[PDB]
């Protein structure tokens, strides 16, 4: 069964705010499967979100990042007039610094060819052929990625912190995000377990599906 | 029978707030069966089956009446206007703690008057040490918690809705609509059972008052509210923990740091040496953005994970270091929190050495000696922790060296002292402090230290650890050596 | 054929209290967070630098939908229907609405102080015999260099000629929002690491690193040099300019290292001219 | 266009105790912090120089909204409503009463000490045998040349002619807030590095360095000279005057370096006159 594609991630600053944390920019410790899936779609230049349902993603967290709070005069749609001071609101947003993680992509469950794994591979062998827009980022648009490269299981030859889907875990990461409200958002309960493996454990495989 | 409402902690979609609301459901139903063991009593003949991590509901007839009875019994208001949550044991809770919890809940959950109608401001003069301090609070009359049953159930069928229900920030803390112009669409939605959990969250979470160390408490009454929300591992464990924490005094709840409140929430937990203790909780800070802010805003959320070592160290700090001074003035029961305790607690949570920089806080920063006096009151405790610090060793040996040197100097003064005259040992100690504080650079301070060590005489400790103390003097910055010399002078005890 | 322009830029050494955060009655805390090795560094928000670029674009022609009224200290919006084909700001920074939206063609991380932050504040009691409140203010400041990283997809631009004004703006960055009255900190580049490649990933995000607390040498980080020597991050697409060029030329074996065959200029303007010529040739301007 | 004026100024050598911070015990600590090489330097705040400029404008006879009653040691407002059109201080330094606020043309940074602070202290004691708690005291002092950086926006001035009095005030700065009784430290400039350009980018911030860690030498920094050599910071827009002119003229190969073709004047008044003529020609005054 073809070896799943592995990507090495290194993002200087990132923030994965919580669905229900709308008053505060308080973030998940780990990139949620939905955000990673969206970033992979951006890398392969896939605007449609339903194109690559079924791809299984597993995240290995190389180093636990530090959580820091920053202030931002974020703009909101409260008043019809743009210049009205009610639009600008000062609030805090948490960020994760020096995030290094490895991503496993298993697109065997996809029913549409070419699969996401093939698209990512072909993108990496021939960067000039792939046509897309924007700048690759994880989380917020301004949080660019320092390094995303094809890597093996031995790239750090170290000890890995996996995200494992436990029914009694702490983190509640969403694998499908409903941006308008919260109807279609689907959550899975995870945990961070420190294990010395170069391959993800089964449970660690998070398979993205439509909310239906 | 079949469950019309099914709730399990093992469900994947649940969050921490859903779990704490589940615990609130568990405890309120426990208190209800304590109050109404005859299921009949429950208007609607509700029947609850409770397990370690599952709450199970059946009733008879239409849902609307059943949930209406449940909600009306769950949330109530006494004659004084304070909150009455049956989940918490109000009988053994005094009136001061009742005022505390009621003020907290209106300050964090019922922050908006669109959800509650208030009564008249009721002032009562409670008597402490022959002082009748007038506690002034705003009584309530109604709130959205008592009448959420209308939204929970369908209007026409008087039954629970089979679709997602739009919720608001009063139900789920932090769930405000970012864009008001899109209020109808961009609203958080949840299933009815999770909505009930978000109804019953307030019972579990405790409320604490935060005091800014920079702000004089006399010139600023506390208004920041810390909400401690604990991670749920078992219904019974959480219920027992909350009921234990009910025992504490209000003056304990006034803290100087978020970590202090988190540790206080786990201060009364039993310690078992066979069982690996590990507890996690969230602290949610609510604070007015400006002086004229109408309602509080969520300004900080911080996770606390407490293990065995951290908790026993915190108990040790609580034992050695002094408690809060309950200053009481004209209706002004101020509370003096020891900054050091918080500093240690913070470092403990950080996992970093407790002795990160106590002296800086105690003296450099604390010229007023607010916590420096606490140092005086808890200097032994400081030394105790320093003793725990292995790295301190070398500085401990230097402390002994300086104490021996000053012993020799005091012996020389005693020899110089004339018969009948009183030797000025206190004056000499004050002179030592003044001379050490006068030293302005490395060269002068090292000159004075070496001269004093020579004048002390033969030092056993400086002989045993010759090379180590010599290298410590050569390497350490002179400010640090001055600090430890001052500590040696203050810690001298013949 | 996608074309990008990423860049890590390091500012000069000076006294800065730029962004700040919510005060505590006393003190105006410069916001800070953890960085390499866990040492606390002072940050400057990304929105700050984007606002600075917007102000630069507005200050020199270059029609802007989101005009900044200096007199009123407010943001007026000329045309509620954003038109990226006309307005430079909607073309670059994008916009948001309730067509529907446009992802900004510019993404920059938050600036980071090159040196860890030490307790540094400034008392400011106001002159006067009467001593009422609103006196004894404290301004936490920092004496370091700020380094921030940006990336633009030139292809995503509606007008491909708009890349050049952004280059001039980043070179002549007017002012990041800060206490210019007390701490006038210039933000013009002092050492640049640019790369103009068709590859989506550029491994040059934060290459300036010195640590060595309270110092200004600002050597190039070892990991960046190792990455260059490895074979990836192609030196032909690299562009190195600024004061770091002196230290690079003083490095031993640099005449034989792969970093030698990268576009390297001491003069910043010569760097900008060469890069702009390459970009114009490749984009057909 | 958009013209701006930037400069780094160096003061004479003398004993200074101008910026006492919150004192501890009996010693009056003067504010200090870290700087180049990690050595502690003494800082004089920019608010002090802004107050000195305000006082200069008040004394010379200009309008000045804020009047400083010397005998009362109090500050009074001529009008409760700030009018930058009419008042020089409101025009230049800005205001915020809490329109309502102004950005402020003058942007000044702190005044750092060129020489690191060793820790010298001075004892003072009340005379007479009758001694009380306030008998003796210690005052910290520093023997250093002070250097601060400032930047103004000519276009941002409501009246463009207001740039002349500010330059005159900088060259004739009155007393900077300190302890003139026992440490009377003149803050008058003795070496300037002025830049008057249309681009914003400034590479003259803190361009002064010491020859020896404890000395009154005050040589020009290597970075500034090297950057002038490399090709940026056009010599035609450079203005250097003061005591550093002698050291520059005693440098080797000076007649061939680009420093030769820059505006250099031994007498500061002549350089100021030339720069003022250039400014008046550029801004149509």
Q: For residue C152, what are its two tokens?
A: 């633009």
For residue C40, what are the β-bridge partners?
C34
> 3-class DSSP state for residue C272?
helix
Q: Do D47 and D246 form a contact (C-beta atoms < 8 A)?
A: no
Q: CA-to-CA distance for A10 and A35, rounded, in angstroms? A: 15
Sheet containing D189-197: order of strands? D32-34, D40-44, D107-113, D146-153, D4-11, D189-197, D238-242, D263-265
Beta bridge partners of A97: A13, A66
Question: Is the peptide bond between A114 and the residue preceding it cis, with omega within 30 degrees of 0?
Answer: yes
Among C138, C144, C148, C147, residue whose Cα is nearest residue C182: C138
For chain A, list the strands marked E by DSSP.
Answer: 5-14, 56-61, 66-75, 88-106, 147-150, 160-164, 171-176, 186-195, 206-207
Alpha-carbon distance of A35 to A138, in angstroms, equals 7
In B74-196, which ranges are E strands?
75-77, 83-85, 116-128, 131-143, 165-166, 189-190
**Distance between CA D130 and CA B303 in Å, rounded?**
60
DSSP-based three-state secondary structure for B377: helix
CA neighbor of C105 nearest in space, from C1, C206, C4, C237: C4
C104: closest CA among C46, C23, C189?
C46
Q: Which of these, B188, B165, B184, B185, lies nearest to B176 by C-alpha position?
A: B188
Under an 8 A CB cutoff, do A183 and B180 touch? Answer: no
Q: Scan for tokens 């294990």, then name that residue.
A: A195
Do B148 and B212 form a contact (C-beta atoms < 8 A)? no
Cα separation, C189 vs C186, whole angstroms: 9
Q: Compute the distance between CA of residue D84 and CA of residue D95 in angstroms, rounded to an integer.
A: 9
Q: Which of C133, C63, C129 is nearest to C92 (CA)?
A: C63
Burial of C266 per CB tally in 10 Å (0-12, 13-18, 19+): buried
H-run or E-run covering B412: helix B392-416
Q: Which residue has the tokens 């929430």?
A: B265
C-alpha span between C209 and C218 (Å, rounded): 6
User: Would you tell me which residues 224-263 of chain D have a C-beta closer than 8 angstroms to some C-beta of chain C?
Assistant: 226-227, 230-232
> Is C177 exposed, middle or buried, given 0-12, 13-18 or 19+ CB atoms closer than 10 A?
middle
Cβ neighbors of D187 (< 8 A, separation 6 or more) are: D11, D49, D52, D146, D173, D175, D176
- Which uninterrupted H or E stretch holds B467? helix B466-475
Q: Are C2 and C153 in contact (CB under 8 A)?
A: yes
Report the distance separating Cα D216 and Cα D145, nearest Å: 8
- b/e B324-335 (16+ beta carbons within 10 angstroms → b): beeeeeeeebbb
Hey, is C53 helix, strand or coil?
helix
Which own/partner contact pairs does D219-224 have at CB distance under 8 Å and 24+ positions apart? D219/D244, D219/D247, D220/D244, D220/D247, D220/D248, D223/C243, D224/D193
d(CA B385, CA B32): 47
Q: What number of helices (H) and strands (E) belong to chain C? A: 6, 13
Burial (CB count <10 Å: 0-12, 13-18, 19+), residue C87 = buried
Query: Which is it for the CA torsion B400, B405, B409, B415, positive or negative?
Result: positive
Helix (H, G, I), strand (E, B) or coil at B409: helix
Helical H segments across D117-217, by residue range: 163-171
How do beta strands D238-242 and D263-265 pair?
parallel
The DSSP result for A186-205, as a single string, is: EEEEEEEEEE--SS--GGG-
Check CB contact of B441 with chain D, cutoff 8 Å: yes
What's phi and psi for B86, nearest 5 deg? -65, -25
The helix/strand/coil state of C51 is helix
3-state helix, strand, coil in chain D (%, to 5): 25, 30, 45
| CB atoms B186 and A20 under 8 Å | no
CB B338, CB B211: distance < 8 Å: no
B184 close to C (CB below 8 A): no
Q: Out of C118, C175, C269, whose CB is closest to D231? A: C269
How far is Cα B419 from Cα D156, in angstroms, rounded to an integer? Answer: 81
Taking alpha carbons only, the member of C275, C222, C264, C272 closest to residue C241 is: C264
The backbone region for C183, taken as left when phi is positive above 0, alpha when psi lies in -120 to 50, beta otherwise, is beta
**Residue B100 parent element (H or E):** helix B95-108
Q: Is C268 helix (H, G, I), strand (E, B) or coil?
A: helix
Closest by CA to A88, choosing from B289, C17, B174, is: B289
Q: How remote is the C-alpha of C249 from its chain's centroid? A: 25
Do residues A100 and A10 make contact, with C-beta atoms less than 8 angstroms apart? Answer: yes
Out of A21, A167, A181, the one facing B174 most closely (by C-beta) is: A21
Contact between D139 and D17 (Cβ < 8 Å) = yes
Beta strands at A171-176 and A160-164: parallel, antiparallel or unpaired? unpaired
Dig out the tokens for B111 from the structure. 């922050």
Residue C9 is encoded by which pair of tokens? 């830029």
Indicate contact of A with B: 3+ CB pairs under 8 A.
Answer: yes
CB D185 within 8 A of CB D14: yes
Cα D237 to its chain centre, rounded Å, is 20
**Cβ contact, residue pair C107, A66, below 8 Å:** no
CA distances from B105 to B111, B143, B322, C253 (A): 8, 11, 30, 69
Cβ–Cβ contact B295 with A under 8 A? no
Q: Nearest Cα to C148, choosing from C260, C35, C276?
A: C35
**Among candidate residues B107, B83, B81, B106, the one with its CA nearest the CA of residue B93:** B83
Report d(CA B211, CA B226) in Å as an integer.
11
Contact C165, C88 (CB under 8 A): yes
Determine whether D55 is exposed, middle or buried from the number of CB atoms within 10 Å of its CB (0-12, 13-18, 19+).
buried
Contact assessment for residue A107 and residue A117, using Cβ atoms and an 8 Å cutoff: yes
- CA D30 – CA D42 distance, rounded (Å): 7
Question: Would the CB atoms of C268 and D232 count as touching at under 8 Å?
Answer: yes
Structural contact between residues A197 and A160, judged by C-beta atoms closer than 8 angstroms: yes
Query: Which H/E stretch holds residue B47?
Result: strand B47-50
Tokens of C267: 């003069």
Closest CA to C146 of C174, C114, C176: C114
Q: Is B463 left (phi over 0), alpha (psi -120 to 50) or beta?
A: alpha
**Contact status, residue A70 vs residue C43, Cβ threshold 8 Å:** yes
C106-108 vs A160-164, strand pairing mode: unpaired
Chain B residue numbers with beta carbons less than 8 Å from the beta carbon of D24 are: 364, 367
In angstroms, how far is CA D8 from the centroid of its own chain? 7
User: Which token pair is D259?
Assistant: 């420093």
CA distances from C31 to A94, B291, C117 (A): 12, 22, 10
Show the tokens assigned to C73.
């200290």
Which pair of structure tokens corresponds to residue D77? 């407002």
Whether chains B and C touch (3+ CB pairs under 8 A) is answered by yes
Identify the bridge partners of residue C189 per DSSP, sorted by sequence position: C11
User: What residues have CB less than 8 Å from B163, skipping those under 6 apart?
Assistant: none
Listing from the earlier edge strand, what are the strands of the sheet with B206-210? B254-255, B206-210, B224-230, B278-287, B297-307
Q: Is B322 buried (19+), middle (13-18) or exposed (0-12) by CB count in 10 A?
A: middle
CB-CB neighbors (< 8 A) of A92 in chain C: 22
Among C2, C255, D219, C49, which Cα is nearest to A135's?
C2
DSSP-based three-state secondary structure for B169: coil
CB B266 within 8 A of CB B279: yes
Scored b (16 or more CB within 10 A) or e, D227-263 reads: bbebebbebeebbbbbebbeebeeeeeeeebebeebb
Query: Structure tokens of A5?
Result: 């594609």
Look at B181 and A78 and tell me if their CB atoms are within 8 Å: yes
| DSSP-H helix ranges across A82-212 | 116-125
Chain C residues closer than 8 Å to D199 by CB: 172
d(CA C80, CA C92): 17
Query: Which residues from C are below 8 Å from B181, CB to CB?
Result: 98
Rounded CA separation C169/C151 (Å): 14
Cβ–Cβ < 8 Å for B28, B87: yes
Residue B51 CB coordination number (10 Å)? 13
The first and second tokens of residue A151, run together, are 């890597």
Write out B59-89 in H/E/C secondary structure.
Answer: CCCCHHHHHHHHHHHHEEECCCCCEEECCCC
CA distances from B413 to B407, B456, B479, B488 (A): 10, 11, 28, 19
Q: DSSP character for B450?
A: H
Residue A112: CB partners within 8 Å, gap ≥ 6?
A51, A52
A124/B325 Cα distance (integer angstroms): 66
The token pair at A86 is 């009610």
- Packing angle between helix B442-456 and helix B466-475, nearest 10 degrees? 160
C-chain residues near D70 (CB < 8 A): none
Would you state the torsion angle of the CA atoms of residues C243, C249, C255, C259, taken in this order, to the nearest 10 degrees?
Answer: -30
Closest CB to B212: pick one of C22, C24, C98. C24
DSSP state of C109: P
Q: Which of B179, B185, B213, B214 to mutate to probe the C interface, most C CBs <10 Å?
A: B214
Resolution in A: 3.6
Distance, CA of D248 to CA of D233 (rounded, Å): 17
Q: What is the DSSP annotation of D207-271?
A: -EE-SSSSSS--EEPHHHHHHHHHT-S-GGGEEEEETHHHHHHTSTTTTTSGGGGSEEESSHHHH
Tell me which residue in A23, A76, A172 faces B169 most closely, judged by beta carbons: A23
- Residue A22 burial by CB count (10 A; 0-12/13-18/19+): exposed, middle or buried? buried
Nearest residue to B206 (alpha-carbon basis) of B23, B8, B7: B23
Contact A45, A130 (CB under 8 A): yes
Cβ of A10: how many Cβ atoms within 10 Å?
A: 19
User: Do C25 and B182 lie within an 8 Å CB cutoff?
Assistant: no
Q: Are A174 and A17 in contact (CB under 8 A)?
A: no
CA atoms of A103 and A200, how far apart (whole Å): 10
Q: Which of D26, D119, D138 sits opposite B441 (nearest CB)?
A: D119
Residue C147 near residue C208 (C-beta atoms within 8 A): yes
């Amino acid at each position: 069964m073809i070896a799943p594609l592995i990507l090495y991630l290194d993002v200087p600053f990132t923030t994965f705010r919580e669905s229900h944390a709308r008053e505060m920019g308080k973030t998940y410790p780990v990139p949620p499967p939905a955000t990673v899936y969206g970033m992979l779609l951006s890398l392969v230049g896939e605007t449609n979100v339903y194109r690559h349902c079924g791809v299984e993603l597993a995240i290995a967290m190389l180093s636990s990042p530090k959580k820091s709070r920053i202030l931002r005069q974020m703009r909101r749609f409260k008043n019809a007039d743009f210049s009205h001071p009610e639009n600008v609101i000062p609030c805090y947003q948490e960020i994760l610094s020096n995030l290094k993680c490895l991503i496993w992509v298993r697109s065997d469950e996809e029913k549409i060819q070419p699969s996401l794994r093939e698209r990512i591979q072909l993108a990496f062998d021939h960067p000039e052929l792939v046509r897309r827009f924007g700048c690759l980022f994880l989380g917020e648009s301004d949080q660019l990625i320092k390094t995303i490269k094809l890597a093996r299981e031995d790239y750090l030859e170290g000890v890995r912190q996996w995200a494992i889907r436990d029914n009694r875990g702490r983190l509640t990461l969403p694998y499908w995000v409903d941006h308008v409200g919260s109807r279609n958002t689907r959550f899975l309960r995870y945990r961070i377990e420190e294990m010395d493996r170069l391959s993800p454990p089964d449970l660690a495989w998070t398979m993205v599906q439509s909310p239906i | 029978t079949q469950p019309k409402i099914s709730l399990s902690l093992h469900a994947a979609d649940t969050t921490i707030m859903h779990r704490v609301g589940m615990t609130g459901l568990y405890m309120t139903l426990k208190r209800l069966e304590k109050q109404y063991p005859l299921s009949r009593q429950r208007g609607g003949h509700i029947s609850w089956f409770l397990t370690a991590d599952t709450i199970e509901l059946f009733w008879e007839g239409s849902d609307f009446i059943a949930l209406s009875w449940l909600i009306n019994e769950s949330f109530q208001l006494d004659d004084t206007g304070l909150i009455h949550l049956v989940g918490l044991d109000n009988d053994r809770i005094d009136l001061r703690q009742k005022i505390h919890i009621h003020e907290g809940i209106c300050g964090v959950f019922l922050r908006l008057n669109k959800f509650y109608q208030a009564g008249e401001i009721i002032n009562t003069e409670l008597r402490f040490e022959e002082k009748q301090v007038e506690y002034q609070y705003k009584s309530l009359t109604w709130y959205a918690h008592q009448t959420f049953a209308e939204k929970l159930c369908e209007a026409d069928t008087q039954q629970l809705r089979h679709d997602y229900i739009q919720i608001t920030s009063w139900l789920y803390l932090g769930g405000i609509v970012r864009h008001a112009r899109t209020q109808n669409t961009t609203k958080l939605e949840e299933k009815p059972e999770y909505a009930l959990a978000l109804l019953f969250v307030p019972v579990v979470c405790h409320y604490c008052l935060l005091h800014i160390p920079s702000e004089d408490l006399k010139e600023r009454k506390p208004h920041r509210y810390l909400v401690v929300i604990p991670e749920i591992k078992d219904f019974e464990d959480a219920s027992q923990r909350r009921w234990r924490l009910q025992q504490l005094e209000t003056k304990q709840f006034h803290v100087s740091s978020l970590g202090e409140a988190g540790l206080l929430y786990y201060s009364l937990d039993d310690i078992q040496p066979e069982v690996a203790y590990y507890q996690a909780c969230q602290v949610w800070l609510y604070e007015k953005t400006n002086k004229a802010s109408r309602q509080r805003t969520l300004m900080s959320i911080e996770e606390i994970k407490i293990d065995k070592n951290i908790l026993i160290t915190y108990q040790q700090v609580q034992k050695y270091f002094k408690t809060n001074y309950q200053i009481i003035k004209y209706k002004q029961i101020f509370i003096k929190v020891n900054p050091i305790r918080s500093l240690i607690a913070d470092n403990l949570v950080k996992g970093i050495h407790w002795w990160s920089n106590f002296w800086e806080k105690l003296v450099i920063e604390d010229s007023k000696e607010y916590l420096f006096n606490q140092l005086f009151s808890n200097r032994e405790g400081f030394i105790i922790m320093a003793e725990n610090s292995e790295e301190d060793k070398q500085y401990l040996i230097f402390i002994k060296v300086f104490q021996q040197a000053m012993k020799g100097n005091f012996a020389k003064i005693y020899a110089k002292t004339e018969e009948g005259k009183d030797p000025p040992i206190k004056k000499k100690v004050e002179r030592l402090r003044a001379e050490l504080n006068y030293c302005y650079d490395e060269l002068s301070f090292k000159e004075y230290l070496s001269d004093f060590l020579v004048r002390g005489g033969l030092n056993k400790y400086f002989n045993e650890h010759q090379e180590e103390i010599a290298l410590l003097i050569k390497k350490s910055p002179w400010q640090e050596i001055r600090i430890w010399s001052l500590l040696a002078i203050a810690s001298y005890k013949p | 054929p996608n074309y990008y322009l990423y860049g890590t830029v390091l500012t000069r050494y000076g006294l800065a209290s730029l962004n700040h955060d919510i005060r505590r009655g006393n003190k105006t805390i410069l916001q800070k967070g953890y960085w390499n090795n866990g040492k606390i560094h002072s940050f400057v928000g990304s929105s700050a630098i984007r606002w600075a670029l917007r102000f630069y674009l507005q200050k020199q022609g270059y029609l802007v939908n989101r005009v900044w009224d200096e007199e009123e200290h407010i943001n007026r919006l000329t045309s509620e229907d954003f038109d990226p084909e006309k307005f430079y700001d909607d073309d670059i920074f994008g916009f948001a609405l309730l067509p529907n939206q446009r992802m900004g063609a510019l993404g920059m991380n938050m600036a980071v102080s090159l040196t860890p932050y030490d307790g540094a504040v400034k008392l400011g009691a106001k002159s006067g015999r009467e001593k009422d409140s609103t006196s004894l203010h404290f301004t936490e400041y920092h004496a370091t260099r700020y380094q921030y990283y940006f990336g633009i997809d030139a292809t995503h631009l509606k007008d491909f000629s708009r890349i050049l004004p952004m280059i001039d703006g980043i070179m002549n960055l007017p002012k990041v929002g800060g206490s210019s009255n007390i701490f006038n900190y210039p933000f013009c580049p002092d050492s640049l690491v640019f790369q103009w490649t068709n590859h989506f990933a550029s491994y040059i995000s934060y290459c300036f690193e010195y640590c060595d607390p309270k110092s200004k040498e600002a050597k190039l980080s070892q990991e960046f040099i190792d990455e260059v020597e490895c074979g990836q991050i192609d030196p032909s697409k690299l562009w190195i300019g600024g004061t770091i060029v002196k230290d690079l030329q003083q490095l031993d074996n640099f005449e034989s290292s792969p970093l030698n065959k990268a576009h390297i200029y001491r003069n910043r303007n010569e760097m900008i001219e060469a890069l702009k010529t390459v970009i114009k040739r490749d984009l057909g301007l």
